[PDB]
Symmetry: D2
Subunit: 97 residues, 4 copies
């Protein structure tokens, strides 16, 4: 069990009930892959380093989790098949909250 930071970029044009739904799917994918969610931050819109789906902005979500390292790559895969997930990046936690 290792602590990771999961950085999710979502489609910037979702309304609030679409946004809450994507968040619920992300939490169930987290729980189903063995993750203990310790911190969630809703960061909001930011301009991307390069456009994704011809969109130069994205809605950012960050999570601090503790999960089995052998499951991380399958979780990142699962999260990437939702059409509204523009980018997933999981890094090892260096300075945990």
């Amino acid at each position: 069990m290792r602590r990771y930071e999961v950085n999710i970029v979502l489609n910037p044009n979702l309304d609030q009930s679409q946004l809450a739904l994507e968040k619920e799917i992300i939490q169930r994918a987290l729980e189903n892959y063995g993750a203990r969610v310790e911190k969630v931050e809703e960061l909001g819109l930011r301009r991307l380093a390069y456009p994704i789906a011809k969109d130069p902005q994205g809605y950012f979500l960050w999570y601090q989790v503790e999960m089995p390292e052998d499951r991380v790559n399958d979780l990142a895969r699962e999260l990437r098949i939702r059409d509204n997930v523009r980018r997933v990046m999981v890094v090892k936690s260096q300075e945990p909250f």
Copy 2:
């Protein structure tokens, strides 16, 4: 004028009026070096990658600024002389809010 992210780690044991005071000194140092403050986040306590002043935790503050690049190193210097500033790290902004 370039956009930067300023990451400040403060002494974790300050009370709220000590904390508000350090924040005011940081804002005046920012304005005095030509910075336009666009975003401020108070992140809270986190465990450091290595202890500083035998303290393994720090109180984190993040700022998104736009300022003259020729002033950045003098600003980082100025911020580092307050006794309660444990660490200053300025990076170029990649995905601005």
Copy 3:
């Protein structure tokens, strides 16, 4: 045209002619998406933050490129369909060589 760093992790178990072949496909994908390759570094084996394809190590390649930002996401996609590419991560260059 913006400068980016492309971080490629390859299968750690390739022999030298397999490795040179993957490198040639990566260069033609780079040229075909409008990239000017300015620097290439062959970093070697490193232990991954989490295992990918049940492999806890990967062979690292880094590139400093200048390319049209509107093409970056399609290039990352293209590079990810080679079976031996375990991970692609493109970030904006902050301190270019």
Copy 4:
């Protein structure tokens, strides 16, 4: 004992015997603070995110070390008092060589 990456930026205008001397002082400071040096890379000149000592470039050195975490901040301090060291940044190693 924890594994760290030490990023040193030196004055870009040193000749080769000045450079070899700074490198020797850095290795003795490393050994004297309990560090096991596992990897050293001489990266060369890069343009800085912001100028330091009115210099917009620096000569980069990277080290992968294993050392006691309680000594890291004193080592960073020691390395920063050499006039030719423009910047020291120590981060926890995530994907070690």
